[PDB]
Amino acid sequence: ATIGRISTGSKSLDKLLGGGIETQAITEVFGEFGSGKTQLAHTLAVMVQLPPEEGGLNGSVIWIDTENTFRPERIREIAQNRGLDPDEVLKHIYVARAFNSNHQMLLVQQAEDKIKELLNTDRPVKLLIVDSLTSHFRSEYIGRGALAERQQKLAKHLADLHRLANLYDIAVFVTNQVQHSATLRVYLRKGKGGKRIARLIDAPHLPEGEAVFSITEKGIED
Ligand SMILES: Nc1ncnc2c1ncn2[C@@H]1O[C@H](COP(=O)(O)OP(=O)(O)O)[C@@H](O)[C@H]1O
Ligand SMILES: [Mg+2]
Ligand code: NA
Secondary structure (H helix, E strand, O other): OOOOEEOOOOHHHHHHOOOOEEOOEEEEEEEOOOOOHHHHHHHHHHHOOOOHHHOOOOOEEEEEEOOOOOOHHHHHHHHHHOOOOHHHHHHOEEEEEOOOHHHHHHHHHHHHHHHHHHOOOOOOEEEEEEEOOOHHHHHHOOOOOHHHHHHHHHHHHHHHHHHHHHHHOOEEEEEEEOOOOOOEEEEEEEOHHHOEEEEEEOOOOOOOOEEEEEEEOOEEEO
């Protein structure tokens, strides 16, 4: 029932987010290629495994990869530099590669089996990443009539994701690349000096400024 919050690594981003990404919610990060969507996903997959006084939820991670951008050595790096054992961190991340959008849909069903298994253990799943939420959908549904059909399949997939978030008290974190019904939309862009800037889109309950952070050996951080 009460909502959990997963620190991103960046104090600035966390404040913008109201303390971190929420369980019982789908948080969508969207932005151009190279903006940092996948790096934020990597960092979150580590942060969630921290205890709560360090901004985590003692959680396991399920990661649905659609573009083969998951890097286990990046996870090990981030974990090591934040004082976690990198091999242990990796063992609590369950990555599956989605071959196409239908298999991506099926993987969400399978995620429920893994979630149920871990639920009342000491490392329940607390984060479900889809990176990228839309890349297969953009690629497969194209041409006259595909707008309605793509949106319908995507809405179904997002409904499935929202049910897991709410039913199991999990944060869902999804990426979308920009040249549907997410709970919170975060616009990410690359700024001057290598900085990254985040802004919330249509989110009255949180701050209306922008967060600024860097991508480092610790993942993201101010
Ligand atoms: N270890 C690192 N330290 C600093 N910047 C990094 C590191 N690793 C990757 N990056 C930067 O992250 C950016 C890519 O982020 P990425 O999450 O893949 O973008 P997206 O998923 O939004 O296309 C690149 O600019 C790259 O230089
Ligand atoms: Mg990416
Ligand atoms: Na919490």
